[PDB]
Every structure is written in C-alpha cells, then in structure tokens.
Design a protein around this motif. Structure first.
Motif, PDB file in Angstrom:
ATOM      1  N   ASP A   1       0.923  -2.435   6.252  1.00 15.67           N
ATOM      2  CA  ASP A   1       1.397  -3.680   6.867  1.00 15.67           C
ATOM      3  C   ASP A   1       2.653  -4.107   6.094  1.00 15.67           C
ATOM      4  O   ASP A   1       2.690  -3.889   4.883  1.00 15.67           O
ATOM      5  CB  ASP A   1       0.262  -4.732   6.888  1.00 15.67           C
ATOM      6  N   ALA A   2       3.648  -4.613   6.822  1.00 18.35           N
ATOM      7  CA  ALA A   2       4.946  -5.056   6.327  1.00 18.35           C
ATOM      8  C   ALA A   2       5.367  -6.450   6.847  1.00 18.35           C
ATOM      9  O   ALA A   2       6.479  -6.905   6.573  1.00 18.35           O
ATOM     10  CB  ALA A   2       5.995  -3.979   6.611  1.00 18.35           C
ATOM     11  N   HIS A   6       3.756  -5.957   0.749  1.00 19.98           N
ATOM     12  CA  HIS A   6       3.617  -5.307  -0.566  1.00 19.98           C
ATOM     13  C   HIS A   6       4.713  -4.253  -0.839  1.00 19.98           C
ATOM     14  O   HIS A   6       5.459  -4.404  -1.812  1.00 19.98           O
ATOM     15  CB  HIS A   6       2.172  -4.792  -0.676  1.00 19.98           C
ATOM     16  N   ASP A   7       4.860  -3.239   0.024  1.00 18.50           N
ATOM     17  CA  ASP A   7       5.829  -2.131  -0.124  1.00 18.50           C
ATOM     18  C   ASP A   7       6.924  -2.074   0.953  1.00 18.50           C
ATOM     19  O   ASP A   7       7.790  -1.203   0.852  1.00 18.50           O
ATOM     20  CB  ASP A   7       5.140  -0.750  -0.255  1.00 18.50           C
ATOM     21  N   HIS A  13      -0.958  -0.073   1.089  1.00 19.91           N
ATOM     22  CA  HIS A  13      -1.510  -1.296   1.758  1.00 19.91           C
ATOM     23  C   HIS A  13      -2.517  -2.136   0.979  1.00 19.91           C
ATOM     24  O   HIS A  13      -3.709  -2.217   1.298  1.00 19.91           O
ATOM     25  CB  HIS A  13      -2.000  -0.986   3.176  1.00 19.91           C
ATOM     26  N   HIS A  14      -1.960  -2.863   0.031  1.00 19.85           N
ATOM     27  CA  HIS A  14      -2.329  -4.236  -0.283  1.00 19.85           C
ATOM     28  C   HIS A  14      -2.299  -5.097   0.991  1.00 19.85           C
ATOM     29  O   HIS A  14      -1.489  -4.827   1.878  1.00 19.85           O
ATOM     30  CB  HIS A  14      -1.299  -4.758  -1.294  1.00 19.85           C
TER      31      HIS A  14
HETATM   32 CU   LIG Z   1       1.269  -2.385   4.298  1.00 19.91          CU
END
Ligand SMILES: [Cu+2]
Length: 23
Positions: A1-2, A6-7, A13-14
């Motif tokens: 997820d963005a 997190h990255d 995926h935090h």
């Molecule tokens: Cu993510």
C-alpha cells in the motif's frame, strides 16, 4: 500500500494489508 506509504512502491507493507514484509 502507498496511500499508507511506508515504502511508496509495492513490497515492504507496513500498514493495512499485513501481507509478509514490513517497516
Ligand atoms: Cu505498502
């Protein structure tokens, strides 16, 4: 997820999905 980026990409995926790799 963005949305919960997190990255900002698509791996570590935090947050939300808790799929495998994190933080
Ligand atoms: Cu993510």
């Amino acid at each position: 997820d963005a949305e919960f980026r997190h990255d900002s990409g698509y791996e570590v995926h935090h947050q939300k999905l808790v799929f495998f790799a994190e933080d």
